[PDB]
Amino acid sequence: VVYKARNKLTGEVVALKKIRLEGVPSTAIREISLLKELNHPNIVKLLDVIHTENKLYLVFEFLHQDLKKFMDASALTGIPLPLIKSYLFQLLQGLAFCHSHRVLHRDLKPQNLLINTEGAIKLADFGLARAFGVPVRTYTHEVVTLWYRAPEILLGCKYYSTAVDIWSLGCIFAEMVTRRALFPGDSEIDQLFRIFRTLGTPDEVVWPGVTSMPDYKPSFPKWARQDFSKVVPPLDEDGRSLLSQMLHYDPNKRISAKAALAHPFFQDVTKPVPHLRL
Amino acid sequence: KPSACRNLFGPVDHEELTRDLEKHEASQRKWNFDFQNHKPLEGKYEWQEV
Amino acid sequence: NEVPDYHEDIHTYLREMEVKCKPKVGYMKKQPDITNSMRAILVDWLVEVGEEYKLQNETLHLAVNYIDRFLSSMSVLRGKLQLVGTAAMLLASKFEEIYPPEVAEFVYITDDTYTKKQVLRMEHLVLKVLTFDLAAPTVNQFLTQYFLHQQPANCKVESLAMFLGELSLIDADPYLKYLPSVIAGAAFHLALYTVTGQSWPESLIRKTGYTLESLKPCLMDLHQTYLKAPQHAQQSIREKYKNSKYHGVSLLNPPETLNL
């Protein structure tokens, strides 16, 4: 982002992104072609694309800042539950739309979620996204920023799909409640062990097939599963229920975004403005 | 050497081909911004930089 | 690899988009120089390129979609047709592949007909003409969904259906007349029938709304294409599907008649 501008006649604000030109980067190819198909109130809107001989311009709707900066600004102040609930509800709507349109985001992290002064939150940065097929093929391995990376990716699964984004969203949910990353690993194996120490080391009962995964090792320490009331202490019964379903080990049992929209946690959801000035 | 390595419809005039491709304002009017030069233009969009 | 929660949404969406991403049926009549026969030569070469660089079948299908849409809008002299095809394969690779080949490899595989800069300029031009709308539905995307309706899974049927779907890419007349979902339907039924004697399942009538009656025109064409395949001027797909990887399905005898 190198330029922004408010429209006089409307008051609407836009942002200008630039890409200098192996030709057009595959990340740009995917980001642009997929964003053109993803018009939703909780997905950052691509307004226009301008090609020049050595530069590619993208015009986006403008949003004030990202969730990471917001949480850091609120590092010592609780983010009110209604706002956490509203943000999660909106993120699930944006993600369900992506999945229903055969797009995996594959880099959901607070830095890639943009917020405004009206209480909206939107998915951004689709540079790492991909259009998937049904059923899925093997795609790029080791995707997703480490702290938000699902265990099936860490264990080298031949196949992954929509569940990987739900895992990341579960991590972000927890992080909004504490302002601290749920699984802050220092390496792939440390990441895996942080997950295991929290959710228990998975076995064939909890996750059929897990012991046959390419990067599973029988030497893995066997940690016991702890209660979610200890994982995210301030979270209420409904919140813990939802979080536990987003962090299910087995990707086939992990809750979908559209199913999550009907969870009792959202029974009293509203759309409050942020508790801090942006 | 591999069988896939082949020309289909003969040699081309590179100068002419490059010319025809080098050939390839309406957006500049829409956004009041000069993209080729990376410069804002006076207009209904007020281009505050970063 | 299944995504049961979104299968129906995605199918419905692809059915919407295949109408929007469809090339113009009669475009070849508006081209001053190139013809369906030249297009066939081009697509057959792209099959070989895909084999040489071990690219996905989906990548090939996407490239053909990009080419047909490009030629629906832009006139191209025969000497530039391979450049169009090369840029389309480059773009489809960037979109679809984990490891897209470098531009230098695409230049090389044309036997150095064009330069790197020319290929990159053509990439730019294709993107402009297609207005960056690259996420097109393909026959392949419908086939893989239809395969989930097998009772039970048969890898020979799947390979033969893919083979038949690929054959359709070669011949703009008649296949530009049909939507990818329809070609996929005809290919699946014809493959299923050839190998097992079974027909288009009721579960796919429920999913797609297509019946053997609605698939009939495309099926009649595809059956003829299948029957005449060993005599076709373009043979790269047949050669590709002799591979044990595809269970040698191109060697199977087509049924003399269908049972519609």
Numbering used by the authors:
A (entry chain A): 17 to 37, 42 to 298
B (entry chain C): 25 to 48, 54 to 79
C (entry chain B): 173 to 432
What does the primary publication say about this deposited structure?
However, this basal level of control can often be modulated, or switched, through post-translational modifications to achieve complex regulatory behavior, as exemplified by the cell-cycle regulator, p27Kip1 (p27), which folds upon binding to cyclin-dependent kinase (Cdk)/cyclin complexes that control cell division. Tyrosine 88, located within D2 subdomain, is inserted into the ATP-binding pocket of Cdk2.
Phosphorylation of Y88 by BCR-ABL was previously shown to partially relieve p27-dependent inhibition of Cdk2/cyclin A, triggering p27 ubiquitination and degradation, and full activation of Cdk2 to drive progression into S phase of the cell division cycle. Upon Y88 phosphorylation, the region 83–89 is ejected from the ATP-binding pocket of Cdk2, resulting in partial Cdk2 activation. Next, we showed that the biochemical effect of this phosphorylation-dependent displacement could be mimicked by deletion of residues 80–94 from p27-KID (p27-KID-ΔC). In order to further illuminate the mechanism of pY88-dependent partial activation of Cdk2, we determined the crystal structure of the p27-KID-ΔC/Cdk2/cyclin A complex. In particular, residues 74–79 of p27-KID-ΔC formed an inter-molecular β-strand with β-strand 2 (β2) of Cdk2, displacing the β1 strand that otherwise forms the G-loop that binds the phosphates of ATP. The structural results for p27-KID-ΔC bound to Cdk2/cyclin A, which mimics the pY88 state as regards Cdk2 activation and show a cyclin A conformation that is essentially identical to that observed within the p27-KID/Cdk2/cyclin A complex, suggest that such changes would have to involve the C-terminal intrinsically disordered region (IDR) of p27.
